[PDB]
Amino acid sequence: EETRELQSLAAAVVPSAQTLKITDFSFSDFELSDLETALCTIRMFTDLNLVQNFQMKHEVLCRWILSVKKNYRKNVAYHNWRHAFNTAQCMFAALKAGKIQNKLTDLEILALLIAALSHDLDHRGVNNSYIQRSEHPLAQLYCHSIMEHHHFDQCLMILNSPGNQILSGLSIEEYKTTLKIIKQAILATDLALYIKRRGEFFELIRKNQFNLEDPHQKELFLAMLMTACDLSAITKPWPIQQRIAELVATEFFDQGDRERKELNIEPTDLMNREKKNKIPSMQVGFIDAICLQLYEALTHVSEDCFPLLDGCRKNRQKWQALAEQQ
Numbered sequence: 001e002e003t004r005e006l007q008s009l010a011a012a013v014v015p016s017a018q019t020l021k022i023t024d025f026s027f028s029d030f031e032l033s034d035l036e037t038a039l040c041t042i043r044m045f046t047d048l049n050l051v052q053n054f055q056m057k058h059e060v061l062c063r064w065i066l067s068v069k070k071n072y073r074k075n076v077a078y079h080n081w082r083h084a085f086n087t088a089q090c091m092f093a094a095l096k097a098g099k100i101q102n103k104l105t106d107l108e109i110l111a112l113l114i115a116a117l118s119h120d121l122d123h124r125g126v127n128n129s130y131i132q133r134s135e136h137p138l139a140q141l142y143c144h145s146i147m148e149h150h151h152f153d154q155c156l157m158i159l160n161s162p163g164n165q166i167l168s169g170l171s172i173e174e175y176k177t178t179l180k181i182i183k184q185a186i187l188a189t190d191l192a193l194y195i196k197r198r199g200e201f202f203e204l205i206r207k208n209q210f211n212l213e214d215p216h217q218k219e220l221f222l223a224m225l226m227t228a229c230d231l232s233a234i235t236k237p238w239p240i241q242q243r244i245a246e247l248v249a250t251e252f253f254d255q256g257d258r259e260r261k262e263l264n265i266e267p268t269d270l271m272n273r274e275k276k277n278k279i280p281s282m283q284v285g286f287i288d289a290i291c292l293q294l295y296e297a298l299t300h301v302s303e304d305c306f307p308l309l310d311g312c313r314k315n316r317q318k319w320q321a322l323a324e325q326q
């Protein structure tokens with residue numbers, strides 16, 4: 001009974017952020033039950049003062065959180081509720097412990113937490129291995145971020161659902177602003193857009209021109225932050241990263257088997273279940289080509305975000321050792 005779950009959530013006591021450990025970049029959700037992750041999400045809206053500043057009703061927030069959780073497919077190995085929850089938790093830790101909070105407006109923080117929780121809504125486990133698709137000479141020919149547009153539509157749908165309207169207390173303007181920020185934040189999770197815009201972001205930082213008052217730079221930064229949180233599984237303590245890496249591998253292999261039957265093509269190592277031995281080398285490659293630069297750049301933005309980078313490096317060292325097969 002969906003109602004039974006709601007009644008349980010809305011009536012439970014929400015433990016403190018400290019007890020929940022949602023402030024740690026090292027936070028893990030493995031020992032938490034769905035109910036507990038929901039309680040964590042409430043603590044996130046509360047401690048970021050979103051419930052207060054936007055007068056959200058307890059029951060309505062609980063319902064919205066349960067609706068979001070419900071619209072994720074538990075059958076998809078990695079891109080499910082737990083990934084979205086972790087993304088939001090990383091966003092919370094970055095805002096608080098990473099001190100990104102005071103560099104943003106209350107609306108932007110509102111949009112970011114909502115986006116982090118809704119960016120992979122109704123994901124089917126389809127991943128695009130062609131990571132350079134945004135830089136191809138004809139990139140403008142194949143519509144980009146199709147699924148991300150779907151995730152947002154889903155996000156918007158749930159926000160406008162009777163009893164789930166956590167943004168009802170906003171003005172007509174505040175609402176419009178918040179929805180635009182959310183849409184961009186969600187679209188930013190298309191890794192291709194990260195590849196396309198990171199160069200610009202890195203340079204602004206390298207040359208000391210970074211300026212969050214410039215709306216264009218604020219938007220670029222929000223996109224980079226979304227990516228940072230989205231990939232943060234790669235920064236977790238070794239044992240946790242290993243398990244998360246398995247889930248990612250499993251969703252890849254599932255696609256490989258699915259495409260073999262539907263497209264009559266054999267999978268590349270990335271999506272070949274018989275190639276688990278090549279995972280560590282690929283992780284090192286993923287880290288070097290995609291992660292390190294992002295977390296390093298974020299550390300320049302705020303030194304307190306350093307632990308994400310640090311955790312990432314430690315994992316590189318772990319995966320590398322395995323790559324060399326001890």
Ligand SMILES: CCCc1nn(C)c2c(=O)[nH]c(-c3cc(S(=O)(=O)N4CCN(C)CC4)ccc3OCC)nc12
Nearest residue numbers: 127128129131231233234245248249279282283285286
């Ligand atoms: C879409 C999944 C993004 C992602 N998140 N996380 C935490 C990981 C990860 O740990 N590894 C990989 C990953 C990336 C590449 S990649 O850098 O070569 N590249 C191709 C595949 N796309 C989807 C990502 C980029 C190759 C293998 C990977 O997982 C190995 C188990 N992707 C993600």
Ligand SMILES: [Mg+2]
Nearest residue numbers: 119120189190
């Ligand atoms: Mg996505």
Ligand SMILES: [Zn+2]
Nearest residue numbers: 119120189230
């Ligand atoms: Zn994601």
